[model samples]
Target: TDFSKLSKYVETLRVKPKQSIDLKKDFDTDYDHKMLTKEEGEELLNLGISKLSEIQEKLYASGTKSVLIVFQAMDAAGKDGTVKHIMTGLNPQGVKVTSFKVPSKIELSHDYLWRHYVALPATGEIGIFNRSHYENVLVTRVHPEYLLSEQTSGVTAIEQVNQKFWDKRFQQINNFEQHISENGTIVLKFFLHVSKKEQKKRFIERIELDTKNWKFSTGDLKERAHWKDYRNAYEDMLANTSTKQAPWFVIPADDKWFTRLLIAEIICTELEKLNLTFPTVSLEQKAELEKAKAELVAEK
Candidate 1:
């Protein structure tokens, strides 16, 4: 499938591999297209959702390929909302979502990618990773001290994790993607870019709302302090890992509606490239069905 044919009438939101993105300066948080109001965005999204649903049916019926949707973002970057909106369009039986958080004792005991290997969608399924193995490079890179805990078989201390160590890990991840891409799964990584002020507003809203209050955590505030650090880590991540085989899309997240629109377009375009269709029955199978129908008619 040629995902490269994704350019549309509008500008492309998908970032090209090796093309550096300055989140603060490069992406606009607002969805400000010429005369693209909320109604227009809604219309596009609904159409996109409906079309995506149709493609998903074919993808499932064909049973030849799979999709791996990787979403990475800062707190309150609308990752949950984006996933919820885009995924509900498809049948639940064919979609799987896995949210990766702190590694468990068992998870840490094995290599970093072991947990993700097990979570990949089976053939004909769509798998979404809320936060994926990219965390190994993004968050862990920001806090190199975390690497100490990840080493069960090798290494002595966190100091041993130098440029060479990270370089090797990056290649490992690239290899993993190449491995899966060859097998059948198409991987698409997305980084939701949001402004600091917008995130603050969302964080405060979560604090005020009873239902969303559960969503906010004091740790989120603590993480906010390291915003600059996370930004640099994300920059490095985008520069290093965004490859042609598995590219990353840095979507504008101030307006979640627009974000979903971009994601749906990208996904729909990729699935359509596969030219999927339901398996066709053979002539003999059709004859068998007619015989069965006549037998049932005779019974009546």
Candidate 2:
């Protein structure tokens, strides 16, 4: 089936206007909930999962390639929930999910992209990253004070030099993604769009709910304070790094069900485009299959 609706939605987000646009009004707040009823969402998710299993079987049978899905978003933007729901039906054998957290000393010693390169999927497998190398630019750009090394690298002024450093990183990212695209991998990047007010509500909910208290972090409040800065960084990243090879898709994630539907539909649509299929049996294989079937039947 054609996924023009979803593709167009993604395309609209790629081209931000010259001036700043309120993400809520532009996307999530006004999104049509009717397009994805809870029941319909659940049903589509099941179908998508089944489709993923079919694709996995085909991948194993035909020795086809794989897909790499990267999710980047601010706190409370539903990255974890998106990963959980969207990937609910996929076979674990065919999928690998990596959540990039704080780097270890070994990882810190290497280039930022080195850890990400190690996590990339092999052929015939799908890889999902909850947070990725973009964190280096997104998080570090906001707090250049955290970058102790860049300070010592003759970039005397962190405030003055951070912008140029991130711009160069973005250029490097473009090259890195293009190289992967030229090889067998397909990259799908998602930015979950949620309102600032919604973020506050979610954070408060975490505090009020007994079970969610563990998730409540003082650091979340600190991050929320720089909401505008994060927005600016995301806008710049979306505008500058979105390329024909690996375009970014910004999903309206206010409604969890709708967000899951959008993600499932996008993945299924991409898988369909790959022209996946089960391997054809040769005449000798067919004969062997018949013999094996007869023996099994006779034994029963």
Candidate 3:
């Protein structure tokens, strides 16, 4: 497959450096492309998975670079499912999945990015962040009081956490990603652009279906109430933090199949760009291997 063409096609989804976006006006949570249908999407995703697995083994053997996939999205955006399906074929040893929740005591004691920094994937590995450092901008920006817990210098009160604070944080995040990219990590971030309508529908299904009851929570409604706040925060984060090194893809999330397919293909395309290959052996090593094989057969 022509990965560059896939990459070019997905440029429609990519957030250009410093580009401002209105999620409602700029993106669709549903399918608008003719190339996609549930069946076609599934077949494409399976192909992506197979190709990804092939590249991953070479990536592991090469041990020269790394991949970090960041998933940032509203509730019920299918982050978990996308990660599950897309990474199913990879060698488990070469992949790391980290989910960030509310900050623990030790986590709060350090700079906000400290915990995430420690969880970064090593060389020859692919790391997935279920929700990432962007949360510092998104969730905390919506509920500013959460910032107080960090005991960050010069921001002791809610009123003190202002636009300057946010701008500084955004810059810090950009700096972190740039530093990692410079040091051999390929960074790819995704914002699962789910609609409010779809979210409500999923929430209702969670409540109505006994098996999905564990996924429902009253706190989800509380966050939904502040949907506009989160939208603004997400827009700001995407606009300010997106860079050439670590681009954000605002993927349509209402159609779960499409979301998974698009994400899988993008991941494979990005990894393909590495041009990775298994370590090669010289003629001397091949001769030694043949001699060893003959000795083993003689012993048998």
Candidate 4:
């Protein structure tokens, strides 16, 4: 796809700096352009994947900057599938995928961000966070009781985990992204905006199929019950945390194909901005390469 067209679509999804976002009105849960058929979407996706692979090679060779992709979504929003597909063309050695689960005993001992800090991608690599630091604000915001588990100072009582507490988290997250962005890690966050209706449909599909039933759990329903609470938390998180350095794209996840296609295009566009190139050899190194080539040719 053309970069200008890609930028136009991406801007529509990206949460702009200083712009307050309301999930209800600003975005559609199921957004299909009708501009492309499913077949056409797949074709464009392949083109995106091809472009990303070419860029990944240069990114790894340059060894100067890194890319960090953050994925946050309600359950059944296709986070795993998205990661698997978008990363299909990337070299395994240069890509790392971290799926953050409930904090371990050791992880809980330290501050929330500490565990994530340990898993960050190094220069010349691409890191994918299946669920990330945003969880401190999102899941915890919906279920404040989860905060009690952390036992941070000044939060001896459940009441202390109020609006102010969450606002502080947003500030800290912003600071973290700013520090990383300035230091060569490009941060891109995606919020998969799936609808309640679509989620229900997925849940039913999982239940009806014997092979897929393993993917379903009673706990999923428990979380689904708090859909509204999660929505409010996401709106607050997206509005407060999106920055010029680390932007959040609220993607339509109701259609799996569209989500993958749009995400691939957005990622390719951003990586292209880096203008990565393979490390160039000096004149001395060029002569050394010619000598080695001549020696190998003569050996046979």
Candidate 5:
């Protein structure tokens, strides 16, 4: 089957004109407004699931390649939901999902890339990171105050450095990802684009809905105050770090269903490129199977 169609779909969507930056109009657009109808979304999801299963079977037989799916987004941008619905049908044995959280003292002791490198996918496997190492540049760049201690590492205080630090990190990251791509891993990064006002509404819903209260954090409100700073950091990341080997796809995520569809399509598209196939049995093996079947029938 020709799988090139999947790649073309992704390329087409990647080039679509992004919504303009009118915060008022864009933010006010309802989260459900631009979504695919329920029937269409379900159909796409099923097709994607089936295709992914086929790819998994072939990958298991081939045992030479791996896939890494990296998801980065602002808070309340549907990262969790995307992971849940888009990957609903893959074989669990072939997949691993890791959520990067605040670094422990041990993780902070090493370079930022150390932990991330260790978490990358092994051959014939899929690894998904809920949040990724990009936070070192994204969040830390926006809130410099958060970087209090560097005395142990001999690095100076955050105030002493400038944009040069971030630029250097971007170069380092690009080289790192390129090395992985050339080896055996396929890297796909996603940026879920949620409007500022939509984030506020989601935050409020967390408070209003008792079941969601656990998901709320006081820190989220603190971060919201610096929304524009975060936006600038993200824009710079998208502009500077997007590379041919590991390009970033910014999905319109105000609509949850649409976000899931885009993510599934993107993944299935990459899997299609693998040209995966099941291993063929030899003629001797087929003859042995036939003899075994004849013996079983005679015994019956």
Candidate 6:
């Protein structure tokens, strides 16, 4: 890793390894969301994208370590745009993006995390989860009654769920993350922290613009009304789930350009940590290349 370039990748961490986290107060909600102008922000975003593209080639060729970038956010927090914009420079061949939504009947029949394990990226690939298994905690915490739909084996009733149940889930997550990290994957979790005011503004745009009309939905407003509940749920989610192997980055999302910039740079930084390099060509392969070169020269 370039020591002098390290400062270029600075980011916000609401909860460090083993540190307590608060969804709202642990970090600034108004943090530098629009600190840069359109030109400046794009310039940074594009540069970071270029850097990430370069690292991604080596990541693919090394074919040893994999990266999982999980994004979680409130409605209108820019998760979709962030994924679409930042990933533009990445080669589609080596990157996989999955958006997790409501589970199907078959999905509900299995263990809660079953779908997630199946969607995990192959070795040497970069995988992005628009919304991940952590939804189990975040949304379920918002409306514990939602758990009834899953019919999770242990409990016959919703009232049976308690703090012990949550603690067990948290531990399971920690263990699961460590399980992957030890095996060769690096997990990076991000929570896009958009202010309530910013969300309202985006929602209004969605409703007002013809192009964005499809993005707006009645359910978004319904979710918006429960802002406080969601924040409290996120507070616990980040606090309990963040660890040495998988840390949650709280990204300010009011400005889409900065979100792209932060995400790209963070990705580059993490890929660098893997010491990724193109696989060295063996001597036998070099001999093969020379032989092929001679054959081509003799042909045409």
TM-score (all chains, Cα) for each model: 0.92, 0.89, 0.96, 0.96, 0.87, 0.92
lDDT of 2: 0.76
Query: Which window of ten consecutive residues has the lowest lDDT sum in model 1?
Result: 1-10
Model 5: CA > 4 A from native: 1-9, 12-36, 150-154, 295-300
Candidate 4, superposed: residue stretches over 4 Å from native: 1-6
Candidate 4 vs candidate 6, TM-score winner: 4
Give the Å shift of residue 197 in candidate 4. Answer: 0.9
Q: What lDDT is obtained when candidate 1 is compared to the true structure?
A: 0.84
* Worst 10 contiguous positions by lDDT, candidate 4: 1-10
* Tens-place lDDT digits, model 4, residues 1-300: 334455676789989886887787879877556456677778888988899998989998899999999999999999999999988888898999999999998998888899898999999999999999999987888787777778543466788877888888899889989999999999999999998999999999999999998867879998899988998899889889999899999999999998998899899888889887878899999999999999999994
Ranking by lDDT: 4, 3, 1, 6, 2, 5
Q: How many times do residue backbones clash in model 6?
A: 0
In candidate 3, stretches whose alpha carbon ends up further than 4 angstroms from where it belongs are 1-8
lDDT of 3 by residue, 1-300 (tens): 334444566879988989898988978899776555577667777888898899889989999999999999999889999889877898899999999999898888888899999999999999999999898998889998877767743578778888898999989999999999999999999999999999999999889999999767789889999999998998888899888899999999999988887888888777788888888889999999999999999994
What tens-digit string does per-residue lDDT give for candidate 5 at 1-300? 233433454563442222223333332223343344656666776777787778876786688889988998888888988887656787788888999998888888888888899999888898999998788778887877655653333346755657777788788888898999999988888888788878888889988898999878889888888888887787767666777687777777777776776688778777788888888889999999999999999994
lDDT of 1 by residue, 82-186 (tens): 999988888998999999999999999899999999999988999999999989887787787777666652566867877787678778888999999999999
For candidate 5, the 10 contiguous residues with the lowest summed lDDT are 15-24
Model 3: pairs clashing at backbone N, Cα or C within 3 Å:
none
Q: Please give the TM-score that candidate 5 achieves against the real structure.
A: 0.87
Looking at candidate 6, the ten consecutive residues that score lowest on lDDT are: 1-10
CA lDDT, every model vs. true structure: 0.84, 0.76, 0.88, 0.88, 0.76, 0.80
